[PDB]
Design a protein around this nucleic acid. Structure first.
Ligand SMILES: [Zn+2]
Ligand SMILES: [Zn+2]
Ligand SMILES: [Zn+2]
Ligand SMILES: [Zn+2]
Lengths: 1263, 676
RNA sequence: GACUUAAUGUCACGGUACCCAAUUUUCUGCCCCG
RNA sequence: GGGGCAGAAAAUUGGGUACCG
């Protein structure tokens, strides 16, 4: 006749559902699915607030299950008194069915209680069931219940108004994953409720019979799960801040849109999101990247005026106004609001329609099939419970998927892929992901299993489900609350080798080395060998690495966890059940069990000593160990490496455009992350490299679609319908400690084809990793191969690895100018034997063409003529554009691919400056503003950048092939674009075709087919020594100012002359003997001091080509080496005379898709002869080729003709006029100044345009 | 005019997908592209669409509802969703009213056919009353053109099936060349109430059913028509059921070369009707005994024709493994033929006879009839040359069997009391196998069982008496999956004894050291190629390995030998030299077939593949026993090869269920699968 | 004590948010006349 | 008599997935 008060507390996020009584419950699917959850009722009207509870029928069901299990443990008796089997069937003829029907098996025992149970006298199990009571199946009054369970109300700790649903629950989509395809079958939604603050419930249980009190109080402590969570049953005796952020975001977007810079706002949004990675000090103490020094315009975007103030100052005021919401919420809300205003202003708001429905399936009821299945254990049987406590460690960056925000709202963006987090922004491994991975690995270890059927009246009797019905897990929350890492991903068009439209997206990843708790519980008669094998497979030891794949980016290698600190404990349930009821099974106190010693264990909990090792387990090493095979290798890169990041470069000091990619690694010894980040090449990148290599080798990239496809590429690397059979991981730099100044600063500029100088807003920098041929970078990478790979597919993967070793696929960006070129590969000894066997089993040439140089200026009069240093080349203004563009999707059989090994000899001193160090040698201590440099070098080894050689060969090739002006600026003086012809305009788009220079060297929407490597110094005397200089080398140059088009095109009715070229002359000796007169009479800020290399030095470089036609390779070999007495100009000081270089073709190799050819000297003459006929055909005016027959090629080659190569003491004088007489540097009676040469009386304009267009025309006598 | 040209480019793709010369793999992509461009037009002009584009959207939804195949035993949710979306997309066209006069006809036609398909595949959501009201309105809007529109015939036939009188329409229905035999039979039966002409039209429908594959909708409509004829107690349903059974038999003989048929849900109930029809032509008074004996033989031929093949699902057919590349072509030919027939419906050596039994034998055929919920046992006696049949109920037997299955899968050896309870329940459920008139004493009995009775031990049946008698103490028991597996001229022709072994845990070291084992392929650590290397027909083969049961495909169930093991398909293809070879398996049957949850299972172990190779008999264990009992069976078979298995089961102590239920558990587990 | 259970019968610890995609293409640290 | 340029143009997401009598 006494009541008891029961408190129910949770230790996991439990499950909530909306309340419907009995028929509206049948109306809804979520209500019928969530019948064993907590129930939520709306309070008041408006559907915003309510209260949750737990029905007493569910607690009664859990209690009678615990009573049944306790009586089945102790042979049908409890504390000496026997209990019968009870009744669990209901006849339809007498009475109705009791509103819930049981499908599981019912534990039974041999019933010997001397009697049958009637109303007068009954066993504790019979009165605890409530059989012989006055009330049943229709509620009349709260009395005449022998045992009554009340509703369990949510114990709100402090009284307030009505509790809202969004404060307690949060929706989440759960999944069902197909085992054979690795793909989701369907999904369903549920409400996960808070347990830290809303995890206590209170109810009353009324007994009116002091004969089942001991059994009830014993089984209250045996109840372990309720509402999807571990539980203990005991008995007792900033919405306003968002609107101002929206208004300030509106002000920022409008201030950006007024300056015609709206599209930066998107980028700015990402940057503000990246500000959550840094602290508040980056806005407080002005750690944001400033502009370049002495520049009136500041940063690229952080110094944009918003209402008259800079964006950094506006952001500082916005942070000072909102200090109460925290740094992280401020940056996240600001970025989200900026992204929302940008998406509103653009006009596209992401419609997202699904045809043919939305695959959300809830389980259903079929009538009939009311079964009662008794299970009777043997008398002698011994039941135990094993608890495995340990720790999951992320060996890779992980990913646990979740929906977008504003979709996980139970009552009713910027990041495409979010990660699952807690309410305190902690990383979370849910119970369902662990349970699914354990089910998958148990199906692998058993070898057979069932796909999970949802509508079932009969329990599945497969081995996996039988073992999984006695496995209990627990969700894990890390002790880390730092924000995730945004990793960006693109997709590539195989035709043009550029990015596809709408292929940028981003993922949120967690740090590797993170650490989560792990609890497993198994209640049964013997510990299975397959579960032991799955635990041994998941854990890691010396040598072995863990193989616990949890999460949802497994093909990218994301989510491979490893189990450590494993302790298995055993509880005897037959002898020490009272200690289990007393200690509540150590539920909620498993953290204490890890650091617990031997002498502090509770009574009944012993260590488990019979845990088998890896070698003694039969389903291990036959089912689990050959599941994935590791292939680990090391890429050796002897060139600079740049995988650009470009968002973190906007949020870091240095003011650099593109920087290398870095990772955040978490350490477990000290709870911080790492002091310095680790450089890496992403798993997406080399996964795409392998995929593109296999697809180009077989030909599967050329297909238009891969839906319902079974090609070798889709079999190996997965498709829509199947998961990938190969899983790639990151390439981490391992020799970064051997370098001094690991990151190198390399700057580039685009040169105008007409003016010959730098184009406006076309200067930029890169910060790659310093890779040199004599000190290369080493990246260690890994991939896993599933069992079932045939010999053809293993041959394909080893062929792709051989293609990567041979240098066909450079890593990172800017591969066409020599970045990321693979120098070698190494294969570790743990690679299997067949893969190792497949991977291990895999002269003076001249051109003899002599050009007849310009005989009238120099071969008539020896050294009495003065020539202008630059001349202009004019072509016919008719360019040929080809619309049948050669695609990169395959290696075509007719076309040629391979490499050219070439050597470069300096005829004149060469100036390639290293602009990484503006102080260079020394010499700014003596005087301020004097720019001095060293030669370009990486790790002390002298080098020429590949971009210089590529630009020089392109400027030769477009002039030879009559291409459009690729780099051209339309500016101040109508404009230069109007005077230029429409045909010579830069090619924009593939609709109107591509000119041959743009066909070979590429455009924005088409990748080039020639790649130029870094040249390396080999032989010869360096460092041209001059005595009167502060180093022995490094003579000081003179002024170098910007070119003026107004001299070239005066008097508006005058069209653009053409491409500017510089003559070959030894005018550097004049600078070399004027060193005393250069330091004086010239301001030290004006002139630059640079290191120089002497003539006769040799460099070596290679040009890699693919899909080349025969005439294109012939014209490339002609532009590399045009003939005897013809050379190129490269480097600084071309008008003063520096930088004449001559290129010799050492070797040519051509491959086919399986050997490397040598191609002797006869065939290269055939290629050059085939190239000559194409220019003959293009000219329209239809033997060893005489190139001067074509008109523009002779005018080109006389500009490139060296007048001092074969003995000739021909040494021409090449210089500029000196404005005004009376000017320093005047020659005695020359009458050679711009005042006397530019005044429409003396030189009549048209004569000046003729003088600038005819090469090597004398200018001081002025013929 | 942009909507006009987009709708015309969608309507061209729709009519190209609606072409009966298009493969379905192209049809899905084409119709999804057309639905994509129509859906994008809707997305950009959300509420301003004309009705002419709404009809195109609804037709695309009908066509995707056609090409969605059931990949299991249930109707998929995608088909119901496609029909629902087409219904509402046509509903907004009806709410866009007062357009053209022909547009109302076309719109109500599309609505009525979509509602007909929805009512067919989901009766609860689309009721008969709402369908009746809509089809009543459709003929009010003039959808009665039976000569240019195929679907108007379907509207009229569904309407006369619902109950409304269509006496005026009948003459326009019959003269159309777009109507077929089943529609004319329904028109003659439901409107004019003519049995005589409807019988001729239904016989023409039965004759045309011979050459169409089972995936066609004509089979579903025919079995539904026969079920309706049985619903109103007509006199014609029996003959039509037997005719459709004969057509299904001669069609099922024409399937691709494996024991495979297409799964359709009515294929059982047609058999369940046809059996009942022959039964109602027996128990109802027939004056001559010779026609009644022919009817009881026809029952046992219906059950055997059901028990021949085992009807794989669609997803298991798509996930089929690849070997014997010409049989790959045959299997993909069968699959594409069935899928092409399914969409084409909507786009417009020697079998021993049942009396060829040796003398002194009795054959018991079993049938589980799900319509009446009964079990029928048909006995054939050769010495008397007689046919009889009896009935039983299988519900409580299924309950006790599932109890034993759960207790066994938890406590394998300790489920002996549940095994004794199951054996007593078999004896109490079927008393006719203990009376002398049904089964004569001292006569060998071959059981040909059906459904979950395959897993029941029929030899261990205990008679419902106090001093209960085991069934195997008076009869020699033999088993067979179907009568089509029986053969003549076993022809062992050799004397070599071959052993194979792969697992080392079972202590068979004393067995492999014996002298008797022959010169070829006796192993330890045997492999699949070593099983394929048998030269010429040994006298006794013994395979000792573990078993693996794939829970969906019986073709992927394998024996655990080395380098991957050998499966059902690799047995059925690769091994050749085992004709007339007695086989003894160490793998239990519970590891070879999956555990079952329904009353119906049709799953064949590797013993049936061994019988299909040409082995004379396979002796195995139904459940797991210890290795000593299997070693004892092997040694007794080696010492005595001619002697019968029930003698060894009686000698080992198998008649002692009352005192030692473990010995009874270990004894009755052994079953011979063959026909001598 | 309503909101908010029905009592001789709840496997929801019966279900991994899963699959597919290379931050990449093009660019000589270069250069003279108001 | 004097220094400029110091990044520009695109892509910033598209789709897919409902075994269970
Ligand atoms: Zn009792
Ligand atoms: Zn299962
Ligand atoms: Zn493919
Ligand atoms: Zn171009």
């Amino acid at each position: 006749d006494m009541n008891i008060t029961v408190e129910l507390t949770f230790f996991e996020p439990y499950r909530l559902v909306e309340w419907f009584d009995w028929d509206a419950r049948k109306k809804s699917h979520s209500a019928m699915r969530g019948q064993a959850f907590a129930q939520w009722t709306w309070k008041g009207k408006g559907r915003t607030a309510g209260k949750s509870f737990i029905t007493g029928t569910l607690v009664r069901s859990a209690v009678i299950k615990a009573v049944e299990e306790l009586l089945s443990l102790n042979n049908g008796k409890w504390e000496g008194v026997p209990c019968c089997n009870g009744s669990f069937q209901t006849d339809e003829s007498k009475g109705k069915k009791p509103s819930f029907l049981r499908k599981r098996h019912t534990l039974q025992w041999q019933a010997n209680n001397k009697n049958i149970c009637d109303k007068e006298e009954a066993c504790p199990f019979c009165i605890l069931l409530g059989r012989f009571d006055n009330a049943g199946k229709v509620h009349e009054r709260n009395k005449d219940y022998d045992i009554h369970f009340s509703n369990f109300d949510l114990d709100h700790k402090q009284e307030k108004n009505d509790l809202r649903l969004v404060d307690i629950a949060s929706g989440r989509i759960l999944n069902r994953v197909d085992f054979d395809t690795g793909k989701a079958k369907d999904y369903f939604r549920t409400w996960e409720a808070d347990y830290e603050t809303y995890g206590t419930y209170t109810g009353r249980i009324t007994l009116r019979n002091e004969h089942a009190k001991k059994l009830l109080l014993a089984s209250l402590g045996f109840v372990d799960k309720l509402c999807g969570a571990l539980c203990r049953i005991e008995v007792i005796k900033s919405e306003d801040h968002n609107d101002e952020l929206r208004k300030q975001a509106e002000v920022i977007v409008e201030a950006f849109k007024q300056n015609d810079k709206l599209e930066k706002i998107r980028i700015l949004a990402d940057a503000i999101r990246t500000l959550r990675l840094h602290g508040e000090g980056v806005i407080e103490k002005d750690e944001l990247p400033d502009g370049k020094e002495e520049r009136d315009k500041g940063h690229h975007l952080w110094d944009i005026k918003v209402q008259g103030t800079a964006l950094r100052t506006k952001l500082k005021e916005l942070w000072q106004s909102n200090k109460d919401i925290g740094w992280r919420k401020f940056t996240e809300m600001l970025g989200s609001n900026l992204y929302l205003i940008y998406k509103k202003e653009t006009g596209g708001v992401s419609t997202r329609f699904r045809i043919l429905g939305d695959t959300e399936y809830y389980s259903k009821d079929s009538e009939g099939s009311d079964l009662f299945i008794p299970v009777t254990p043997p008398e002698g049987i011994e039941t135990k419970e094993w608890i495995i406590v340990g720790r999951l460690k992320a060996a890779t960056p992980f990913y646990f998927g979740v929906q977008q925000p504003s979709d996980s709202i139970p009552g009713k963006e910027h990041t495409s892929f979010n990660i699952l987090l807690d309410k305190e922004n902690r990383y979370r491994i849910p119970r369902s992901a662990l349970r699914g991975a354990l089910r998958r690995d148990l199906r692998t270890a058993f070898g057979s299993g069932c796909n999970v059927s949802l509508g079932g009246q009969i329990l599945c009797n497969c081995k996996v489900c039988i073992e999984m019905r006695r496995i209990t897990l627990k969700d894990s929350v890390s002790d880390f609350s730092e924000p995730p890492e945004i990793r960006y991903r693109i997709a590539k068009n195989p035709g043009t080798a550029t990015v596809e439209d709408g292929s940028l997206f981003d993922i949120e990843v967690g740090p590797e080395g993170l650490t989560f708790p792990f609890v497993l519980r198994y209640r049964g008669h013997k510990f299975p060998e397959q579960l032991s094998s799955v635990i041994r497979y998941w854990e890691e030891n010396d040598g072995k690495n863990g193989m616990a794949w949890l999460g949802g980016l497994d093909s990218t290698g994301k989510g491979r966890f490893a189990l450590k600190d494993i302790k298995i404990f055993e509880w005897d349930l037959n002898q020490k059940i009272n200690e289990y009821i007393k200690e509540r099974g150590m539920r909620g106190k498993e953290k204490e069990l890890l650091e617990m010693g031997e002498s502090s264990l509770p009574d009944g909990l012993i260590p488990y000593k019979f845990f088998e090792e890896r070698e003694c387990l039969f389903p291990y090493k036959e089912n689990l160990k050959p599941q994935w095979s590791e292939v680990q290798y090391t890429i050796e890169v002897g060139s600079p490496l740049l995988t650009a990041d470009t968002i973190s470069a906007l949020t870091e000091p240095g003011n650099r455009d593109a920087i290398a990619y870095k990772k955040r690694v978490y350490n477990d010894g000290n709870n911080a992350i790492e002091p310095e980040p680790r450089f890496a090449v992403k798993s997406e990148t080399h996964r795409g490299i392998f995929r593109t290599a296999v697809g180009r080798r077989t030909g599967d990239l050329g297909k238009e679609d891969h839906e319902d496809c079974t090609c070798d590429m889709c079999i190996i690397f997965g498709n829509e319908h199947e998961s990938s059979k190969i899983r790639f991981e990151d390439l981490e730099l391992i020799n970064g400690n051997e370098f001094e100044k690991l990151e190198k600063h390399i700057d580039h500029v685009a040169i105008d084809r007409f003016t010959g100088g730098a184009l406006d807003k076309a200067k930029f920098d890169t910060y790659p990793l310093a890779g040199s041929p004599k000190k290369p970078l080493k990246l260690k990478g890994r991939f896993w191969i599933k069992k079932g790979f045939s010999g053809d597919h293993k041959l394909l993967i080893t062929t792709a690895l051989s293609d990567i070793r041979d240098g066909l696929y450079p890593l990172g960006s800017k591969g066409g100018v020599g970045y990321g070129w693979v120098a070698g590969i190494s294969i570790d000894d743990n690679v299997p034997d067949d893969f190792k066997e497949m991977i291990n089993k895999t002269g003076p040439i001249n051109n003899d063409y002599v050009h007849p140089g310009h005989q009238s200026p120099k071969q008539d009069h020896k050294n009495k003529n003065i020539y202008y240093p630059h001349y202009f080349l004019d072509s016919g203004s008719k360019v040929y554009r080809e619309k049948d563009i050669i695609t990169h999707e395959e290696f075509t059989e007719e076309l040629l691919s391979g490499k050219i090994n070439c050597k470069l000899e300096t005829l004149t001193p060469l100036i390639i400056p290293d602009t990484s160090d503006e102080n260079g040698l020394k010499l700014q201590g003596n005087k301020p503003g004097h720019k001095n440099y060293k030669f370009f070098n990486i790790n002390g080894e002298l080098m020429i950048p590949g971009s210089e050689l590529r630009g020089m060969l392109r400027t030769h090739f477009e002039a030879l092939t009559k291409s459009c002006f690729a780099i051209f600026g339309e500016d101040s003086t109508k404009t230069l674009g109007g005077k230029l012809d429409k045909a010579l305009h830069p090619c924009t788009g593939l609709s109107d075709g591509l000119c041959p220079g743009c066909h070979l060297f590429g455009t924005t929407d088409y990748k080039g087919r020639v790649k130029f490597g870094f040249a390396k110094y080999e032989n010869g005397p360096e460092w041209l020594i001059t005595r009167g200089n502060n180093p022995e080398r490094s003579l000081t140059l003179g002024v170098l100012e910007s070119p003026r088009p107004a001299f070239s095109i005066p008097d508006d009715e005058s069209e653009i002359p053409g491409r500017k070229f510089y003559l070959h002359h030894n005018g550097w000796r004049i600078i070399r003997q004027k060193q005393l007169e250069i330091r004086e009479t010239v301001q030290p800020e004006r002139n630059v001091t640079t290191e120089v290399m002497d003539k006769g030095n040799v460099f070596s470089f290679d040009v890699r080509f693919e899909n080349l036609r025969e005439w294109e390779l012939g014209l490339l070999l002609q532009s590399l080496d045009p003939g005897k007495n013809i050379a190129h100009k490269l480097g600084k000081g071309k008008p003063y005379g520096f930088g004449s270089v001559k290129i010799k073709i050492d070797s040519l190799h051509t491959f086919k898709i399986d050997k490397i050819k040598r191609v002797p000297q006869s065939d290269i003459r055939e290629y050059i002869n085939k190239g000559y006929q194409k220019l003959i055909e293009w000219s329209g005016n239809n033997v060893l080729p005489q190139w001067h027959v074509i008109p523009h090629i002779d005018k080109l080659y006389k500009l490139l003709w060296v007048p001092f190569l074969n003995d000739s003491k021909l040494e021409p004088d090449v210089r500029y006029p000196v404005l005004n007489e009376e000017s320093k540097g005047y020659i005695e009676g020359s009458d050679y100044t711009y005042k006397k040469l530019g005044d429409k009386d003396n030189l009549p304009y048209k004569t000046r345009v003729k003088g600038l267009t005819t090469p090597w025309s004398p200018w001081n006598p002025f013929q | 005019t942009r909507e006009d040209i987009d709708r015309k480019e969608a309507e061209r793709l729709l009519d190209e997908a609606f072409n009966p010369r298009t493969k379905p793999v192209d049809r899905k992509k084409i119709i999804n592209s057309a639905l994509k461009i129509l859906i994008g037009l809707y997305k950009e002009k959300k509420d301003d669409l004309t009705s002419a584009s709404f009809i195109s959207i609804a037709r695309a939804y009908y066509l995707v509802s056609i090409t969605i195949l059931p990949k299991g035993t249930t109707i998929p949710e995608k088909k119901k969703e496609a029909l629902r979306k087409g219904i509402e997309f046509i509903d907004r066209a009806i709410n866009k009213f007062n357009g053209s006069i022909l547009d109302s006809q076309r719109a109500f036609r599309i609505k009525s056919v979509l509602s007909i398909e929805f009512n067919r595949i989901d009766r609860e959501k689309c009721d008969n009353i709402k369908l009746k009201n809509l089809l009543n309105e459709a003929v009010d809007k003039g959808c009665t053109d039976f000569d240019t529109y195929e679907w108007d015939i379907q509207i009229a036939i569904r309407l006369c099936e619902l109950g409304v009188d269509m006496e005026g329409h009948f003459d326009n229905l019959i003269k159309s060349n777009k109507a077929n035999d089943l529609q004319k039979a329904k028109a003659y039966y439901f409107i004019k109430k003519d049995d005589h002409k409807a019988k001729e039209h239904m016989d023409k429908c039965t004759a045309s059913l011979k050459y169409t594959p089972c995936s066609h909708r004509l089979w579903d409509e025919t079995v539904g028509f026969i079920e309706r004829l049985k619903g109103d107690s007509s006199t014609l349903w029996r003959d039509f059921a037997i005719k459709t059974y004969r057509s299904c038999r001669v069609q099922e003989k024409e399937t691709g070369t494996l024991r495979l048929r297409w799964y359709w849900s009515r294929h059982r109930v047609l058999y369940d009707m046809a059996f009942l029809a022959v039964k109602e032509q027996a128990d109802d008074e027939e004056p001559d005994v010779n026609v009644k004996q022919a009817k009881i033989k026809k029952l046992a031929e219906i059950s055997d024709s059901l028990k021949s093949r085992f009807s794989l699902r669609l997803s298991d057919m798509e996930k089929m493994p690849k070997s014997d590349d010409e049989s790959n072509h045959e299997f993909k030919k069968f699959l594409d033929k069935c899928v092409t027939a399914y969409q084409d419906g909507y786009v417009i050596a020697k079998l021993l006879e049942l009396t060829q039994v040796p003398e002194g034998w009795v054959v018991v055929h079993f049938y589980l009839n799900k319509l009446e919920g009964m079990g029928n046992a048909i006995v054939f006696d050769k010495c008397a040359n007689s046919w009889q049949y009896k009935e039983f109920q299988y519900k409580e037997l299924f309950e006790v069997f599932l109890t034993w299955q759960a207790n066994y899968n938890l406590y394998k050896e300790n489920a002996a009391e549940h095994l004794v309870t199951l054996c007593k329940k078999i004896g109490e459920t079927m008393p006719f196998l203990f009376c002398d008139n049904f089964i004569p004493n001292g006569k060998d009995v071959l059981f040909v069982p059906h459904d979950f009775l395959h897993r029941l031990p029929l030899h261990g049946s205990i008679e419902n008496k106090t001093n209960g008698k085991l069934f195997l103490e008076n009869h020699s028991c033999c088993y067979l999956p179907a009568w089509s597996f029986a053969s003549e001229k076993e022809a062992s022709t050799s004397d070599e004894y071959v052993l194979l072994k792969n697992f080392d845990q079972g202590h068979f070291e004393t067995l492999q050291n014996n002298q008797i084992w022959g010169t070829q392929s006796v192993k330890d650590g045997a492999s699949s190629d070593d099983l394929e290397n048998i030269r010429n027909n040994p006298r006794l083969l013994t395979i000792l390995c573990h078993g693996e049961a794939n829970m969906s495909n019986p073709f992927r169930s394998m024996l655990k030998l080395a380098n991957g093991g050998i499966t059902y398909l690799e047995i059925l293809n690769s091994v050749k030299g085992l004709k007339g070879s007695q086989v003894i398996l160490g793998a239990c049957e519970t590891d070879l077939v999956p555990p079952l949850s329904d009353v119906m299972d049709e799953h064949y172990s590797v013993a049936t593949a061994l019988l299909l190779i040409g082995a004379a008999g396979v002796v195995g264990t139904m459940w797991k026993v210890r290795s000593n009992k299997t070693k004892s069976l092997i040694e007794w078979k080696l010492e005595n090869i001619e002697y019968k298995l029930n003698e060894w089961q009686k000698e080992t102590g198998g008649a002692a269920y009352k005192d030692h239920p473990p010995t009874f558990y270990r004894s009755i587990a052994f079953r011979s699968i063959g026909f001598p």
